[PDB]
Amino acid sequence: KFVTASYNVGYPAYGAKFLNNDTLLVAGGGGEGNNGIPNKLTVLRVDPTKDTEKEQFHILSEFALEDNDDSPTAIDASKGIILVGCNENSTKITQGKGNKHLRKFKYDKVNDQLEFLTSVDFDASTNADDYTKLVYISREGTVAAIASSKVPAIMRIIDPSDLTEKFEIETRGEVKDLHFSTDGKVVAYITGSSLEVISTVTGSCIARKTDFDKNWSLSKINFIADDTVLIAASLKKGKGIVLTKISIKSGNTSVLRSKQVTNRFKGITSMDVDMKGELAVLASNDNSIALVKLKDLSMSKIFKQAHSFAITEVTISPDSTYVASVSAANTIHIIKLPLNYAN
Ligand SMILES: [K+]
Ligand SMILES: [K+]
Ligand SMILES: [K+]
């Protein structure tokens, strides 16, 4: 019923995104050391049904980042535009030489090749410990949002064409996760205990919510419909994951439905929702990939030990055919779903 396949990409992977139905973008590396381990962007064609590794995972192109660059920490892609969070060498950073840590690439869909376009230093930081925590770009590729680990927490909303900052949002607490609505006109973000919704056009508040259970730690957020977000939280005391749907309208929010979908794990490291808005995928702390059917908020399948440790990102192809996950254990896990699985 499910076809699965695994591949060792050759370096610890920290980001993954599907460029189309069939093509996976992966980013990561061994970091800045003179260690014989590359820092790379890798583009692969995947087909988990085939018999050999070369057929299941075909590498279309690779971009070698600097051997003395940090490993990439975050990526996203939309319509051939690729945005990558990646510190330069710590020495260059520390000695005030500049940190072009937000980089723009182009994937040529016909050439399959990767091109470095331009990069920019947004944080103006001289602390090598600061990294780009979140990188997201809207479906149409017209707006993006990035988030530093640095203090105080700031969300920058930028133009992906030339990497200019549209506006700077000083968030109140630490930004946990982040998502754009499908039209790209709204970005929603979460801290550990609040939801904030902002227009990407004006920078104005649209809606806000802070009355979550005090035992909840908000973890991830994805849009599932035009005016509806899905928030994943973990139990502070106890073990479990709550998925909640919150509707956003006219300055107010309302909880459509809330439900704990499992008690098997303590927390999750990644979440994605398919474009159809029907399926959610979770990557757990204990290294599982879980499939959640959004109509019922029910967990319908768990792939135990899909990586050996640290699952960094999970991504669903636009046709809802493949579920891809990558980890710091150097592995890529591919799941093929039966057609209309969630239905
Ligand atoms: K290296
Ligand atoms: K890194
Ligand atoms: K998200």
- CA 313 remoteness from chain centre: 6
- For ligand 3, a single-atom ion, the residues with CB < 5 A are 177, 179, 222
Q: Single out the residue of 49, 58, 41 nearest to residue 7, CA to CA.
A: 58
**Rounded to an integer, what distance in angstroms lies between the CA atom of residue 100 and that of residue 38?**
19
Rounded-to-10 torsion of CA 266, 301, 27, 124:
-40
The domains of the chain, with CATH numbers, are 1-343 (2.130.10.10)
Contact 101, 88 (CB under 8 A): yes
**Rounded to an integer, what distance in angstroms lies between the CA atom of residue 206 and that of residue 173?**
18
Task: Output helix, strand, coil percentages for the chain, rounded to the nearest 5.
Answer: 5, 50, 45
CA of 65 to the centre of ligand 1 (A): 9
Q: Which residue has the tokens 């909303």?
A: 157
Tell me how far CA of residue 161 lies from CA of 80, 81, 110, 166, 199, in angstroms.
11, 8, 20, 12, 19
CA of 178 to the centre of ligand 2 (A): 20
CA of 40 to the centre of ligand 1 (A): 10
**Rounded to an integer, what distance in angstroms lies between the CA atom of residue 332 and that of residue 269?**
15
**Rounded to an integer, what distance in angstroms lies between the CA atom of residue 147 and that of residue 153?**
8
16: Cα within 13 Å, side-chain hemisphere: 30
Q: Which ligand has the nearest atom to the CA of 73?
A: 2
Which residue(s) pair with 106 in the sheet?
A: 81, 115
Q: Single out the residue of 244, 248, 232 nearest to residue 199, CA to CA.
A: 248
**Rounded to an integer, what distance in angstroms lies between the CA atom of residue 126 and that of residue 322?**
40
**Rounded to an integer, what distance in angstroms lies between the CA atom of residue 211 and that of residue 298?**
24
CA of 230 to the centre of ligand 3 (A): 9
- CA 292 remoteness from chain centre: 17
Q: Which two tokens stand for residue 292?
A: 């959640």
CA of 327 to the centre of ligand 2 (A): 13
Tell me how far CA of residue 289 lies from CA of 123, 171, 223, 299, 305, in angstroms.
34, 31, 20, 11, 8
| Residues 6 or more apart in contact with residue 296 via CB below 8 angstroms | none
Q: Single out the residue of 329, 341, 334, 224 nearest to residue 272, CA to CA.
A: 224
CA of 261 to the centre of ligand 1 (A): 40
Contact 23, 318 (CB under 8 A): no
Which amino acid, one-letter code, is at 61?
S
CA of 73 to the centre of ligand 2 (A): 5
Contact 8, 331 (CB under 8 A): yes
Contact 253, 208 (CB under 8 A): yes
**Rounded to an integer, what distance in angstroms lies between the CA atom of residue 46 and that of residue 42?**
12
**Rounded to an integer, what distance in angstroms lies between the CA atom of residue 150 and that of residue 129?**
8
Q: What is the DSSP string of 62-78?
A: EEE--TTSPPP-EEEEE
Which residue(s) pair with 96 in the sheet?
A: none
- CA 103 remoteness from chain centre: 16
CA of 69 to the centre of ligand 2 (A): 9
CA of 125 to the centre of ligand 3 (A): 25
CA of 237 to the centre of ligand 3 (A): 24
Q: Which ligand has the nearest atom to the CA of 187?
A: 3
H-type alpha helices, the chain: 53-56, 90-94
CA of 180 to the centre of ligand 3 (A): 8
Give me the sign of the Cα torsion angle 131, 143, 163, 165: negative
Q: Which residue has the tokens 């699952």?
A: 311
Q: Which ligand has the nearest atom to the CA of 28?
A: 2
CA of 181 to the centre of ligand 2 (A): 28
**Rounded to an integer, what distance in angstroms lies between the CA atom of residue 250 and that of residue 197?**
12
CA of 43 to the centre of ligand 2 (A): 20
**Rounded to an integer, what distance in angstroms lies between the CA atom of residue 208 and that of residue 228?**
13
Q: What is the DSSP string of 278-296?
A: SEEEEEETTS-EEEEETTT
